[PDB]
């Protein structure tokens, strides 16, 4: 199977440069083009450019000619995209894709900010038709993202993890809720597992009936 494995998320300061990678496997790397695509949060797709890894030749969208530099390393079967003079406008998910767009990388999130990383506080939303709703409020973190699971992944039915909101403070908040049988509140432990990778914060909060 063809795979394009992109590097992990980046939190980088404005005015600096960042270099993201796209490691190809499962095919002759030098016989196919690699294209790069930008997607700002909640927006559409934008084409950055393309590289021929065999010849090293490139073509750039004029809008990215100054911003972006595409390179390829034949020995490691890896394509790279460097973005220079970073601003908040560059905060986006960046995808690599093999020519034509059948095979895509999983995307790399780049957040450009001078703000400090901050881990969340996690507060219970306690339960109080036979259905009870409960949840966890994940408050005051930066940057995105936070992921939430319930009962270490054993509880998925009826879960809603809401998109985060940017508060007026400049910090993010989200909530995750689940609906369960009220008859289970006395017999089943409910734990929300909150992961904020940028701050290495893990919280497993038990949500008790009140």
């Amino acid at each position: 199977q063809v795979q394009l494995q992109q590097s992990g998320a980046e939190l980088v300061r404005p005015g600096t440069s960042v270099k993201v990678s796209c490691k190809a496997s499962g095919y002759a790397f030098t016989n196919y083009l690699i294209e790069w695509i930008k997607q700002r949060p909640g927006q559409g797709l934008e084409w950055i450019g393309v590289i021929n890894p065999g010849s090293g030749g490139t073509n750039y969208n004029e809008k990215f000619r100054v911003k972006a530099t595409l390179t390829a390393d034949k020995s490691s079967s890896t394509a790279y995209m460097q973005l220079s003079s970073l601003t908040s406008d560059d905060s986006a998910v960046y995808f690599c894709a093999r020519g034509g767009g059948y095979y895509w990388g999983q995307g790399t999130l780049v957040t450009v900010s001078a703000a400090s990383t901050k881990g969340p506080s996690v507060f219970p939303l306690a339960p109080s038709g036979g259905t009870a709703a409960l949840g966890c409020l994940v408050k005051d973190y930066f940057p995105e993202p936070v992921t939430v699971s319930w009962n270490s992944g054993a509880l998925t039915s009826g879960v809603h993890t809401f998109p985060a909101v940017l508060q007026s403070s400049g910090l993010y908040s989200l909530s995750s809720v689940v609906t369960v049988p009220s008859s289970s509140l006395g017999t089943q432990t409910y734990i929300c597992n909150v992961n904020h990778k940028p701050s290495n914060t893990k919280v497993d909060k038990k949500v008790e009936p009140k």
């Binding site: 294209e35 695509i37 559409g44 797709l45 934008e46 084409w47 450019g49 393309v50 073509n59 750039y60 969208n61 004029e62 809008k63 995808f95 894709a97 034509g100 767009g101 059948y102 895509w104 990388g105 999983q106 995307g107 506080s121 507060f123 219970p124 939303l125 306690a126 109080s128 038709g129 259905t131 709703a133 949840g135 409020l137 408050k139 809603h160 809401f162 998109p163 985060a164 909101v165 508060q167 908040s173 989200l174 909530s175 809720v177 609906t179």
Partner: protein, 218 residues
């Protein structure tokens, strides 16, 4: 450059019916080799795009054959037959004829279902949060359709303005509903000065606004 236009930002469709998504280009995408270099992509929330149709009318490998593409050299249609609830997503056209390659702005597929009013729940601030000086009151509107739903907060029967923030989930891929949270943020001191916290919900499924409330301390 070649400009790609998608005239509708969304198209609604009931599962089992067919739907058409349109795209246009500012230059013919026809090549002398006979192919028209128009591509259709689907992107599901949180996923990378995936190709559906290549060179205008050819079904990409593994894509269900209820997807089809047609067009002139300058106007194109993605036809999705026998739509399923799982077809929710955003559909983009793209031209590969000339550099720079360019994308259309995207068309959401909205799945139509029976109107469903939200189930509404209200959560007081936790005592744990109160210890830190802030109170968040949460109103959950669960599993409703359509997307439009208005929340008004009242504290001691006074309509609130300026202190709430809402988040909405993506349309569910199985049941085609939405959920919404509204969070009212106030200081601990203000939370403890008032008694009645109420969230009032307006929605097509409701004949009159629904209120859920709690009384602080009870």
């Amino acid at each position: 450059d070649i400009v790609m236009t998608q005239a509708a930002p969304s198209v609604p469709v009931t599962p089992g019916e067919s739907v058409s998504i349109s795209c246009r280009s500012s230059k013919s995408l026809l090549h002398s080799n006979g192919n028209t270099y128009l591509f259709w992509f689907l992107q599901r929330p949180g996923q990378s795009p995936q190709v559906l149709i290549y060179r205008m009318s050819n079904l990409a490998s593994g894509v269900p054959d209820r997807f089809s593409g047609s067009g002139s050299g300058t106007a194109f249609t993605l036809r999705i037959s026998r739509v399923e609830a799982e077809d929710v997503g955003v559909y983009y056209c793209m031209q590969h004829l000339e550099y720079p390659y360019t994308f259309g702005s995207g068309t959401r597929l909205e799945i139509k279902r029976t109107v469903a009013a939200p189930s509404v729940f209200i959560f007081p601030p936790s005592d744990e949060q109160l210890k830190s000086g802030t109170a968040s009151v949460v109103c959950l509107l669960n599993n409703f359709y359509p997307r439009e739903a208005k929340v008004q907060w009242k504290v001691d029967n006074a309509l609130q303005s300026g202190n709430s923030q809402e988040s909405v989930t993506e349309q569910d891929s199985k049941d085609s509903t939405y959920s919404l949270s509204s969070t009212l943020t106030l200081s601990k001191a203000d939370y403890e000065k008032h008694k009645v916290y109420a969230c009032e919900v307006t929605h097509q499924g409701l004949s009159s606004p629904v209120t859920k409330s709690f009384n602080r301390g009870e």
